[PDB]
Amino acid sequence: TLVRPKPELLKLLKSVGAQKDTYTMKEVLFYLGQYIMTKRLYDEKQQHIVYCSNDLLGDLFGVPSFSVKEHRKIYTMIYRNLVVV
Ligand SMILES: O=C(O)c1[nH]c2cc(Cl)ccc2c1-c1c(-c2ccccc2)ncn1Cc1ccc(Cl)cc1
């Protein structure tokens, strides 16, 4: 169960200190959430709405925001930026 992020997500994954170029999703999802945390994309008062508008992540995901409860939506959006080895 492995993927190669497409370059733009790979750059985003490296900005949160990823060292590889081919990951498990788990590792992808992990660095993503870390990115979300470290770029302050969450709303502290909505508590699981990620506001990715006006940020590389939103450009990758093609959406201004999403719930972390929408597992499929997010999986879909991630896989657009991936290539399964
Ligand atoms: O646990 C993680 O590493 C994690 N990684 C993520 C990546 C994204 Cl793109 C969205 C949510 C999470 C996410 C996450 C969060 C979260 C919420 C707000 C800020 C930071 C993290 N809450 C639960 N999760 C787990 C998770 C994993 C996959 C999916 Cl599809 C949804 C939620």
Side-chain angles (χ1 to χ4, degrees), residues 1-18 20-46 48-84:
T1 357
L2 285 152
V3 304
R4 186 166 9 277
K6 286 188 283 209
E8 278 316 337
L9 171 68
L10 185 59
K11 305 223 187 78
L12 146 29
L13 293 195
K14 286 166 179 167
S15 51
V16 279
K20 309 170 64 206
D21 278 51
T22 78
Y23 307 67
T24 36
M25 270 292 285
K26 317 94 212 156
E27 276 165 288
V28 160
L29 284 155
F30 181 76
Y31 295 115
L32 281 174
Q34 296 297 116
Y35 177 85
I36 293 175
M37 287 307 311
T38 60
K39 295 258 75 160
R40 264 132 111 43
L41 293 179
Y42 61 104
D43 184 39
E44 83 287 18
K45 290 179 261 95
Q46 286 266 26
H48 38 83
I49 307 299
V50 165
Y51 287 100
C52 45
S53 223
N54 328 295
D55 178 285
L56 163 48
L57 176 62
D59 312 341
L60 291 207
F61 277 6
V63 294
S65 62
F66 62 84
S67 173
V68 313
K69 298 189 70 165
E70 306 159 295
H71 292 112
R72 313 201 230 127
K73 183 166 171 62
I74 285 151
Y75 261 51
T76 284
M77 293 184 271
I78 288 163
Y79 279 115
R80 296 209 223 86
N81 299 272
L82 286 180
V83 182
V84 191

Coordinates of all heavy atoms in Angstrom, one line a residue, unseen atoms left out:
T1 N 0.8 -1.2 0.0 CA 0.0 0.0 0.0 C 0.9 1.3 0.0 O 1.1 1.9 1.1 CB -1.0 0.0 1.2 OG1 -0.9 -1.2 2.0 CG2 -2.4 0.2 0.7
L2 N 1.3 1.7 -1.2 CA 2.3 2.8 -1.4 C 1.9 3.8 -2.5 O 1.2 3.4 -3.5 CB 3.6 2.2 -1.7 CG 4.5 1.5 -0.7 CD1 5.4 0.5 -1.4 CD2 5.3 2.6 0.1
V3 N 2.3 5.0 -2.3 CA 2.0 6.1 -3.3 C 3.3 7.0 -3.5 O 4.1 7.0 -2.6 CB 0.9 6.9 -2.7 CG1 -0.4 6.1 -2.5 CG2 1.2 7.7 -1.5
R4 N 3.3 7.6 -4.6 CA 4.2 8.7 -4.9 C 3.4 10.0 -5.0 O 2.6 10.1 -6.0 CB 5.0 8.3 -6.1 CG 6.2 9.2 -6.6 CD 7.0 8.5 -7.7 NE 6.2 7.3 -8.1 CZ 6.2 6.1 -7.5 NH1 7.0 5.9 -6.4 NH2 5.5 5.1 -7.9
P5 N 3.6 10.9 -4.1 CA 2.9 12.2 -4.3 C 3.4 12.8 -5.6 O 4.5 12.7 -5.9 CB 3.4 13.0 -3.1 CG 4.6 12.3 -2.6 CD 4.3 10.9 -2.8
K6 N 2.4 13.5 -6.3 CA 2.8 14.3 -7.4 C 3.5 15.5 -6.9 O 3.4 16.0 -5.7 CB 1.6 14.6 -8.2 CG 1.2 13.5 -9.1 CD 0.1 13.8 -10.0 CE -1.2 14.0 -9.4 NZ -2.3 13.6 -10.5
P7 N 4.4 16.1 -7.7 CA 5.4 17.0 -7.2 C 4.9 18.1 -6.2 O 5.6 18.3 -5.3 CB 6.0 17.7 -8.5 CG 5.8 16.6 -9.6 CD 4.5 16.0 -9.2
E8 N 3.7 18.6 -6.5 CA 3.2 19.7 -5.7 C 2.9 19.4 -4.2 O 3.2 20.0 -3.3 CB 2.1 20.5 -6.3 CG 2.6 21.5 -7.4 CD 3.8 22.3 -6.9 OE1 3.9 22.4 -5.6 OE2 4.6 22.8 -7.7
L9 N 2.2 18.2 -4.1 CA 2.0 17.6 -2.8 C 3.3 17.2 -2.2 O 3.5 17.3 -1.0 CB 1.0 16.5 -2.9 CG 0.9 15.7 -1.6 CD1 0.2 16.6 -0.7 CD2 0.1 14.3 -1.9
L10 N 4.2 16.6 -3.0 CA 5.5 16.2 -2.4 C 6.2 17.4 -1.8 O 6.8 17.3 -0.7 CB 6.4 15.5 -3.4 CG 7.8 15.0 -2.9 CD1 7.7 14.0 -1.8 CD2 8.5 14.4 -4.1
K11 N 6.1 18.6 -2.5 CA 6.7 19.8 -1.9 C 6.0 20.1 -0.6 O 6.7 20.4 0.4 CB 6.7 21.0 -2.9 CG 7.4 20.6 -4.3 CD 8.4 21.8 -4.8 CE 8.9 21.5 -6.2 NZ 7.9 21.7 -7.4
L12 N 4.7 20.1 -0.6 CA 3.9 20.4 0.6 C 4.3 19.3 1.7 O 4.4 19.7 2.8 CB 2.4 20.4 0.3 CG 1.3 19.9 1.2 CD1 1.7 20.0 2.7 CD2 0.0 20.7 1.0
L13 N 4.4 18.1 1.4 CA 4.7 17.0 2.4 C 6.2 17.3 2.9 O 6.4 17.1 4.1 CB 4.7 15.6 1.8 CG 3.3 15.0 1.3 CD1 3.4 13.5 1.1 CD2 2.2 15.3 2.3
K14 N 7.1 17.7 2.1 CA 8.4 18.0 2.5 C 8.5 19.2 3.4 O 9.3 19.3 4.3 CB 9.4 18.2 1.4 CG 9.8 16.9 0.7 CD 10.5 17.3 -0.6 CE 11.0 16.1 -1.4 NZ 11.4 16.5 -2.8
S15 N 7.6 20.2 3.1 CA 7.6 21.4 4.0 C 7.3 21.1 5.4 O 7.6 21.8 6.3 CB 6.7 22.5 3.4 OG 5.4 22.0 3.1
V16 N 6.6 20.0 5.7 CA 6.3 19.5 7.0 C 7.4 18.4 7.4 O 7.1 17.6 8.3 CB 4.9 19.0 7.2 CG1 4.0 20.1 7.5 CG2 4.3 18.2 6.0
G17 N 8.5 18.4 6.7 CA 9.6 17.5 7.1 C 9.5 16.0 6.7 O 9.9 15.2 7.5
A18 N 8.8 15.7 5.6 CA 8.9 14.4 5.1 C 10.2 14.2 4.4 O 10.7 15.2 3.7 CB 7.7 14.1 4.1
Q19 N 10.8 13.1 4.5 CA 12.2 12.8 4.0 C 12.1 11.9 2.8 O 13.1 11.8 2.1 CB 13.0 12.1 5.1
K20 N 11.0 11.2 2.5 CA 10.9 10.2 1.4 C 10.4 10.8 0.1 O 10.3 12.1 0.0 CB 10.0 9.0 1.8 CG 10.4 8.4 3.2 CD 9.3 7.4 3.6 CE 9.2 6.2 2.7 NZ 7.9 5.6 2.8
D21 N 10.2 10.0 -0.9 CA 9.5 10.3 -2.2 C 8.5 9.2 -2.5 O 7.9 9.2 -3.6 CB 10.4 10.5 -3.4 CG 11.1 11.9 -3.4 OD1 11.6 12.3 -2.4 OD2 11.0 12.5 -4.5
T22 N 8.3 8.3 -1.6 CA 7.2 7.3 -1.8 C 6.7 6.8 -0.4 O 7.5 6.2 0.3 CB 7.6 6.2 -2.7 OG1 8.3 5.2 -1.9 CG2 8.3 6.7 -3.9
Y23 N 5.4 7.0 -0.2 CA 4.9 6.8 1.1 C 3.8 5.8 1.1 O 3.3 5.4 0.1 CB 4.4 8.2 1.6 CG 5.4 9.4 1.5 CD1 5.8 9.8 0.3 CD2 5.8 10.0 2.7 CE1 6.7 10.9 0.2 CE2 6.7 11.0 2.6 CZ 7.2 11.5 1.4 OH 8.1 12.6 1.3
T24 N 3.4 5.4 2.3 CA 2.1 4.9 2.5 C 1.2 6.1 2.7 O 1.6 7.2 2.9 CB 2.1 4.2 3.9 OG1 3.0 4.8 4.8 CG2 2.6 2.7 3.7
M25 N -0.1 5.9 2.5 CA -1.2 6.9 2.7 C -1.1 7.4 4.1 O -1.1 8.7 4.3 CB -2.6 6.3 2.6 CG -3.1 6.4 1.2 SD -3.4 8.1 0.7 CE -4.9 8.4 1.6
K26 N -1.0 6.5 5.0 CA -0.8 6.8 6.5 C 0.2 7.9 6.6 O -0.1 8.9 7.3 CB -0.4 5.5 7.3 CG -1.1 4.2 6.9 CD -0.3 3.4 5.8 CE -1.1 2.5 4.9 NZ -0.4 2.3 3.6
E27 N 1.4 7.7 6.1 CA 2.4 8.7 6.1 C 2.0 10.0 5.4 O 2.4 11.1 5.7 CB 3.7 8.2 5.4 CG 4.6 7.4 6.3 CD 5.6 6.7 5.4 OE1 5.2 5.7 4.8 OE2 6.8 7.1 5.4
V28 N 1.2 9.9 4.3 CA 0.7 11.0 3.6 C -0.2 11.7 4.5 O 0.0 12.9 4.7 CB 0.1 10.6 2.2 CG1 -0.9 11.7 1.7 CG2 1.2 10.2 1.2
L29 N -1.2 11.0 5.0 CA -2.2 11.7 5.8 C -1.6 12.3 7.0 O -2.0 13.4 7.4 CB -3.3 10.7 6.3 CG -4.3 10.3 5.3 CD1 -4.9 8.9 5.6 CD2 -5.4 11.3 5.2
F30 N -0.6 11.6 7.6 CA 0.1 12.2 8.7 C 0.8 13.5 8.4 O 0.6 14.5 9.2 CB 1.2 11.3 9.2 CG 2.0 11.8 10.4 CD1 1.4 11.8 11.7 CD2 3.2 12.4 10.2 CE1 2.1 12.4 12.7 CE2 3.9 12.9 11.3 CZ 3.4 12.9 12.5
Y31 N 1.6 13.6 7.4 CA 2.2 14.9 7.1 C 1.2 16.0 6.6 O 1.4 17.2 6.8 CB 3.3 14.7 6.0 CG 4.4 13.8 6.5 CD1 4.7 12.6 6.0 CD2 5.2 14.3 7.5 CE1 5.7 11.8 6.5 CE2 6.3 13.5 8.0 CZ 6.6 12.3 7.5 OH 7.6 11.5 7.9
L32 N 0.1 15.5 6.1 CA -1.0 16.5 5.7 C -1.5 17.2 7.0 O -1.4 18.4 7.1 CB -2.1 15.8 4.9 CG -1.7 15.6 3.4 CD1 -2.7 14.8 2.7 CD2 -1.5 16.9 2.8
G33 N -2.0 16.4 7.9 CA -2.6 16.9 9.2 C -1.5 17.8 9.9 O -1.9 18.8 10.4
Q34 N -0.3 17.4 9.8 CA 0.8 18.2 10.4 C 0.9 19.5 9.7 O 1.2 20.6 10.3 CB 2.1 17.4 10.2 CG 2.2 16.1 11.0 CD 2.1 16.3 12.4 OE1 1.1 15.9 13.1 NE2 3.1 17.0 13.0
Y35 N 0.8 19.5 8.3 CA 0.8 20.7 7.5 C -0.4 21.6 7.9 O -0.2 22.8 8.2 CB 0.7 20.3 6.0 CG 0.6 21.5 5.1 CD1 1.8 22.2 4.7 CD2 -0.6 22.0 4.7 CE1 1.7 23.3 3.9 CE2 -0.7 23.1 3.9 CZ 0.4 23.7 3.5 OH 0.3 24.8 2.6
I36 N -1.6 21.0 8.0 CA -2.8 21.7 8.4 C -2.6 22.4 9.7 O -3.0 23.5 9.9 CB -4.0 20.7 8.5 CG1 -4.3 20.1 7.1 CG2 -5.2 21.4 9.1 CD1 -5.4 19.0 7.2
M37 N -2.0 21.6 10.7 CA -1.7 22.1 12.0 C -0.7 23.2 12.0 O -0.9 24.3 12.5 CB -1.2 21.1 12.9 CG -2.2 20.1 13.4 SD -3.6 20.9 14.1 CE -2.8 22.1 15.2
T38 N 0.4 23.0 11.3 CA 1.4 24.0 11.3 C 1.2 25.2 10.4 O 1.9 26.2 10.5 CB 2.8 23.3 11.0 OG1 2.7 22.7 9.7 CG2 3.1 22.2 12.0
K39 N 0.3 25.2 9.5 CA -0.2 26.3 8.7 C -1.4 27.0 9.3 O -1.9 28.0 8.7 CB -0.5 26.0 7.2 CG 0.6 25.4 6.4 CD 1.2 26.5 5.4 CE 2.0 27.5 6.2 NZ 3.0 28.2 5.3
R40 N -1.9 26.5 10.4 CA -3.1 27.0 11.0 C -4.3 27.0 10.1 O -5.0 28.1 9.9 CB -2.8 28.5 11.5 CG -2.4 28.5 12.9 CD -1.2 29.4 13.2 NE -1.4 30.7 14.0 CZ -2.2 30.8 15.0 NH1 -2.9 29.8 15.6 NH2 -2.3 32.0 15.5
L41 N -4.6 25.9 9.5 CA -5.7 25.8 8.5 C -7.0 25.3 9.2 O -8.1 25.4 8.5 CB -5.4 24.8 7.4 CG -4.3 25.4 6.5 CD1 -3.9 24.4 5.4 CD2 -4.6 26.8 5.9
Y42 N -7.0 24.9 10.4 CA -8.2 24.5 11.1 C -8.9 25.7 11.8 O -8.3 26.7 12.0 CB -7.9 23.4 12.1 CG -6.9 23.8 13.2 CD1 -7.4 24.1 14.5 CD2 -5.6 24.0 13.0 CE1 -6.5 24.5 15.5 CE2 -4.7 24.4 14.0 CZ -5.2 24.6 15.3 OH -4.3 25.0 16.3
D43 N -10.2 25.6 12.0 CA -10.8 26.6 12.8 C -10.9 26.1 14.2 O -11.5 25.0 14.5 CB -12.2 26.9 12.3 CG -12.8 28.1 13.1 OD1 -12.1 29.0 13.5 OD2 -14.1 28.0 13.3
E44 N -10.3 26.8 15.2 CA -10.4 26.4 16.6 C -11.9 26.4 17.1 O -12.2 25.7 18.1 CB -9.5 27.3 17.4 CG -10.0 28.7 17.9 CD -10.1 29.8 16.7 OE1 -10.1 29.4 15.5 OE2 -10.2 31.0 17.1
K45 N -12.7 27.2 16.5 CA -14.2 27.3 16.9 C -15.2 26.4 16.1 O -16.3 26.3 16.5 CB -14.6 28.7 17.0 CG -13.9 29.5 18.1 CD -14.3 31.0 18.2 CE -13.2 31.9 17.6 NZ -13.5 32.3 16.2
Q46 N -14.7 25.8 15.0 CA -15.5 24.7 14.3 C -14.9 23.3 14.6 O -15.6 22.3 14.5 CB -15.3 25.0 12.8 CG -16.1 26.1 12.2 CD -17.5 25.7 11.7 OE1 -18.1 24.7 12.2 NE2 -18.1 26.5 10.7
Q47 N -13.6 23.3 14.9 CA -12.9 22.2 15.6 C -12.6 21.0 14.7 O -11.6 20.3 15.0 CB -13.6 21.9 17.0 CG -14.1 20.5 17.2
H48 N -13.3 20.7 13.7 CA -12.8 19.9 12.6 C -13.2 20.4 11.1 O -13.4 19.5 10.2 CB -13.1 18.4 12.8 CG -14.4 18.1 13.4 ND1 -15.6 18.0 12.6 CD2 -14.8 17.7 14.6 CE1 -16.6 17.7 13.4 NE2 -16.1 17.5 14.6
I49 N -13.1 21.7 10.9 CA -13.2 22.2 9.6 C -11.9 22.8 9.2 O -11.3 23.6 10.0 CB -14.4 23.2 9.4 CG1 -15.7 22.6 9.9 CG2 -14.5 23.6 7.9 CD1 -16.2 21.4 9.1
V50 N -11.4 22.3 8.1 CA -10.1 22.7 7.7 C -10.4 23.8 6.7 O -11.0 23.5 5.7 CB -9.3 21.5 7.1 CG1 -8.1 22.0 6.3 CG2 -8.9 20.5 8.2
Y51 N -9.9 25.0 7.0 CA -10.0 26.1 6.0 C -8.7 26.1 5.3 O -7.7 26.6 5.8 CB -10.2 27.4 6.8 CG -11.7 27.4 7.3 CD1 -11.9 27.1 8.6 CD2 -12.7 27.6 6.4 CE1 -13.3 27.1 9.1 CE2 -14.0 27.6 6.9 CZ -14.3 27.4 8.2 OH -15.6 27.4 8.6
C52 N -8.7 25.6 4.1 CA -7.5 25.5 3.3 C -7.6 26.6 2.2 O -6.7 26.6 1.3 CB -7.3 24.1 2.7 SG -8.8 23.4 2.0
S53 N -8.6 27.4 2.2 CA -8.6 28.5 1.2 C -7.4 29.3 1.4 O -6.8 29.4 2.5 CB -9.8 29.4 1.5 OG -10.5 29.7 0.3
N54 N -6.9 29.8 0.2 CA -5.7 30.7 0.2 C -4.6 29.9 0.9 O -4.0 30.4 1.8 CB -6.0 32.0 1.0 CG -7.5 32.4 0.8 OD1 -8.0 32.8 -0.2 ND2 -8.2 32.5 2.0
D55 N -4.2 28.7 0.3 CA -3.1 28.0 0.8 C -2.8 26.9 -0.3 O -3.7 26.5 -1.0 CB -3.3 27.4 2.2 CG -2.2 26.5 2.7 OD1 -2.0 25.4 2.2 OD2 -1.4 27.0 3.5
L56 N -1.5 26.4 -0.4 CA -1.2 25.4 -1.3 C -2.1 24.1 -1.3 O -2.5 23.5 -2.3 CB 0.3 24.9 -1.2 CG 0.7 23.6 -1.8 CD1 0.3 23.5 -3.2 CD2 2.2 23.5 -1.7
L57 N -2.5 23.8 0.0 CA -3.3 22.6 0.2 C -4.6 22.7 -0.5 O -5.1 21.8 -1.2 CB -3.6 22.3 1.7 CG -4.5 21.2 2.0 CD1 -4.0 19.8 1.5 CD2 -4.8 21.1 3.5
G58 N -5.3 23.9 -0.4 CA -6.5 24.1 -1.1 C -6.4 24.1 -2.6 O -7.3 23.6 -3.3
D59 N -5.3 24.7 -3.1 CA -5.0 24.6 -4.5 C -4.9 23.1 -4.9 O -5.3 22.7 -6.0 CB -3.7 25.3 -4.8 CG -3.7 26.7 -4.3 OD1 -4.8 27.3 -3.9 OD2 -2.6 27.3 -4.1
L60 N -4.3 22.3 -4.1 CA -4.1 20.8 -4.4 C -5.4 20.1 -4.3 O -5.7 19.2 -5.1 CB -3.1 20.2 -3.4 CG -1.7 20.6 -3.7 CD1 -0.8 19.5 -3.2 CD2 -1.4 21.0 -5.1
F61 N -6.2 20.4 -3.2 CA -7.5 19.8 -2.9 C -8.6 20.3 -3.7 O -9.7 19.7 -3.8 CB -7.8 19.9 -1.5 CG -7.1 18.9 -0.6 CD1 -6.2 18.0 -1.1 CD2 -7.4 18.9 0.8 CE1 -5.6 17.0 -0.3 CE2 -6.8 17.9 1.6 CZ -5.9 17.0 1.0
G62 N -8.5 21.6 -4.3 CA -9.5 22.2 -5.1 C -10.8 22.6 -4.4 O -11.9 22.5 -4.9
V63 N -10.6 23.0 -3.1 CA -11.7 23.3 -2.3 C -11.3 24.3 -1.2 O -10.1 24.4 -0.9 CB -12.2 22.0 -1.6 CG1 -12.8 21.0 -2.6 CG2 -11.2 21.3 -0.8
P64 N -12.2 25.1 -0.7 CA -11.8 26.2 0.2 C -11.8 25.7 1.6 O -11.1 26.2 2.5 CB -12.9 27.3 0.0 CG -14.1 26.5 -0.4 CD -13.6 25.2 -1.0
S65 N -12.5 24.6 1.9 CA -12.6 24.0 3.2 C -13.2 22.6 3.1 O -13.8 22.3 2.0 CB -13.3 24.9 4.1 OG -14.7 25.0 3.7
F66 N -13.1 21.8 4.1 CA -13.7 20.5 4.2 C -13.7 20.0 5.7 O -12.9 20.6 6.5 CB -12.9 19.5 3.3 CG -11.5 19.3 3.7 CD1 -11.1 18.4 4.6 CD2 -10.5 20.1 3.0 CE1 -9.8 18.3 5.0 CE2 -9.2 19.9 3.4 CZ -8.8 19.0 4.3
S67 N -14.6 19.1 6.0 CA -14.5 18.5 7.4 C -13.5 17.4 7.4 O -13.4 16.6 6.5 CB -15.9 18.0 7.7 OG -15.9 17.2 8.9
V68 N -12.8 17.2 8.5 CA -11.9 16.1 8.7 C -12.8 14.8 8.9 O -12.2 13.7 8.8 CB -11.0 16.2 9.8 CG1 -10.3 17.5 9.8 CG2 -11.8 15.9 11.1
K69 N -14.1 15.0 9.1 CA -15.0 13.8 9.1 C -15.4 13.3 7.8 O -16.0 12.2 7.7 CB -16.4 14.3 9.7 CG -16.3 14.7 11.2 CD -17.7 14.9 11.8 CE -18.4 13.6 12.0 NZ -19.6 13.8 12.9
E70 N -15.1 14.0 6.7 CA -15.4 13.5 5.4 C -14.2 12.6 4.8 O -13.4 13.2 4.1 CB -15.7 14.6 4.4 CG -16.9 15.5 4.8 CD -16.8 16.8 4.1 OE1 -15.8 17.6 4.3 OE2 -17.8 17.1 3.4
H71 N -14.2 11.4 5.2 CA -13.0 10.5 4.9 C -12.8 10.3 3.5 O -11.7 10.3 3.0 CB -13.1 9.3 5.7 CG -13.0 9.4 7.2 ND1 -14.1 9.2 8.1 CD2 -12.0 9.8 8.0 CE1 -13.7 9.4 9.3 NE2 -12.4 9.8 9.3
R72 N -13.9 10.0 2.7 CA -13.9 9.7 1.3 C -13.5 11.0 0.5 O -12.7 10.9 -0.4 CB -15.2 9.2 0.9 CG -15.7 8.2 1.8 CD -16.8 7.2 1.2 NE -17.9 7.2 2.2 CZ -19.2 7.4 1.9 NH1 -19.6 7.7 0.6 NH2 -20.1 7.4 2.8
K73 N -14.1 12.1 0.9 CA -13.9 13.4 0.2 C -12.3 13.6 0.2 O -11.7 13.8 -0.8 CB -14.6 14.5 0.9 CG -14.5 15.9 0.2 CD -15.6 16.8 0.8 CE -15.4 18.3 0.4 NZ -15.5 18.6 -1.1
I74 N -11.8 13.5 1.4 CA -10.4 13.7 1.6 C -9.5 12.7 0.9 O -8.5 13.1 0.3 CB -10.0 13.7 3.0 CG1 -10.5 14.9 3.7 CG2 -8.5 13.5 3.1 CD1 -10.9 14.8 5.2
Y75 N -9.9 11.4 0.9 CA -9.2 10.4 0.3 C -9.2 10.7 -1.2 O -8.2 10.6 -1.8 CB -9.8 9.0 0.5 CG -9.0 8.3 1.6 CD1 -8.7 8.9 2.8 CD2 -8.5 7.0 1.4 CE1 -8.0 8.2 3.8 CE2 -7.8 6.3 2.3 CZ -7.5 6.9 3.5 OH -6.8 6.2 4.5
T76 N -10.4 11.0 -1.8 CA -10.4 11.4 -3.1 C -9.4 12.5 -3.5 O -8.8 12.5 -4.5 CB -11.9 11.9 -3.5 OG1 -12.8 10.8 -3.7 CG2 -11.8 12.7 -4.9
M77 N -9.4 13.5 -2.6 CA -8.7 14.8 -3.0 C -7.2 14.5 -2.9 O -6.5 14.9 -3.8 CB -9.0 15.9 -2.0 CG -10.5 16.4 -2.1 SD -10.8 17.9 -1.0 CE -11.4 17.2 0.6
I78 N -6.8 13.7 -1.9 CA -5.4 13.2 -1.8 C -5.0 12.4 -3.0 O -4.0 12.6 -3.6 CB -5.2 12.4 -0.5 CG1 -5.2 13.3 0.7 CG2 -4.0 11.6 -0.6 CD1 -5.4 12.6 2.0
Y79 N -5.9 11.5 -3.5 CA -5.5 10.6 -4.6 C -5.4 11.3 -5.9 O -4.7 10.8 -6.8 CB -6.4 9.4 -4.7 CG -6.1 8.3 -3.8 CD1 -6.9 7.9 -2.8 CD2 -4.9 7.6 -3.9 CE1 -6.6 6.9 -1.9 CE2 -4.5 6.6 -3.0 CZ -5.4 6.2 -2.0 OH -5.1 5.2 -1.2
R80 N -6.0 12.5 -6.0 CA -5.8 13.3 -7.2 C -4.3 13.7 -7.3 O -3.8 14.0 -8.4 CB -6.7 14.5 -7.3 CG -8.2 14.2 -7.4 CD -9.0 15.2 -8.1 NE -10.3 15.5 -7.5 CZ -10.4 16.4 -6.5 NH1 -9.4 17.2 -6.1 NH2 -11.6 16.6 -5.9
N81 N -3.6 13.8 -6.2 CA -2.3 14.3 -6.1 C -1.2 13.2 -5.9 O -0.1 13.5 -5.4 CB -2.3 15.3 -4.9 CG -3.2 16.5 -5.2 OD1 -2.8 17.5 -5.8 ND2 -4.5 16.3 -4.8
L82 N -1.6 12.0 -6.2 CA -0.8 10.8 -5.9 C -0.7 10.0 -7.2 O -1.4 10.1 -8.2 CB -1.6 10.0 -4.9 CG -1.6 10.4 -3.4 CD1 -2.5 9.4 -2.7 CD2 -0.2 10.6 -2.8
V83 N 0.3 9.0 -7.1 CA 0.4 7.9 -8.1 C 0.7 6.6 -7.3 O 1.9 6.5 -6.8 CB 1.5 8.2 -9.2 CG1 1.6 7.2 -10.2 CG2 1.3 9.6 -9.8
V84 N -0.2 5.7 -7.3 CA 0.1 4.4 -6.6 C 1.2 3.6 -7.3 O 1.0 3.1 -8.4 CB -1.1 3.5 -6.5 CG1 -0.9 2.3 -5.5 CG2 -2.4 4.2 -6.0
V85 N 2.3 3.4 -6.6 CA 3.5 2.7 -7.1 C 3.1 1.3 -7.6 O 2.5 0.6 -6.8 CB 4.6 2.5 -6.0
Ligands
LIG1 O1 -4.4 12.3 12.2 C1 -3.9 12.7 11.2 O2 -2.7 12.7 11.0 C2 -4.7 13.5 10.2 N1 -4.2 13.7 9.0 C3 -5.1 14.4 8.3 C4 -5.0 14.8 6.9 C5 -6.1 15.5 6.4 CL1 -5.9 16.0 4.8 C6 -7.2 15.7 7.1 C7 -7.3 15.3 8.4 C8 -6.2 14.6 9.0 C9 -6.0 14.1 10.3 C10 -6.9 14.0 11.3 C11 -7.4 15.1 12.1 C12 -7.0 16.4 12.1 C13 -7.9 17.4 12.3 C14 -7.6 18.8 12.3 C15 -6.3 19.1 12.3 C16 -5.3 18.1 12.2 C17 -5.7 16.8 12.1 N2 -8.4 14.6 12.9 C18 -8.5 13.3 12.6 N3 -7.7 13.0 11.7 C19 -7.5 11.6 11.1 C20 -8.0 11.5 9.7 C21 -7.3 10.8 8.8 C22 -7.8 10.7 7.5 C23 -9.0 11.3 7.2 CL2 -9.5 11.0 5.6 C24 -9.7 12.0 8.1 C25 -9.2 12.1 9.4

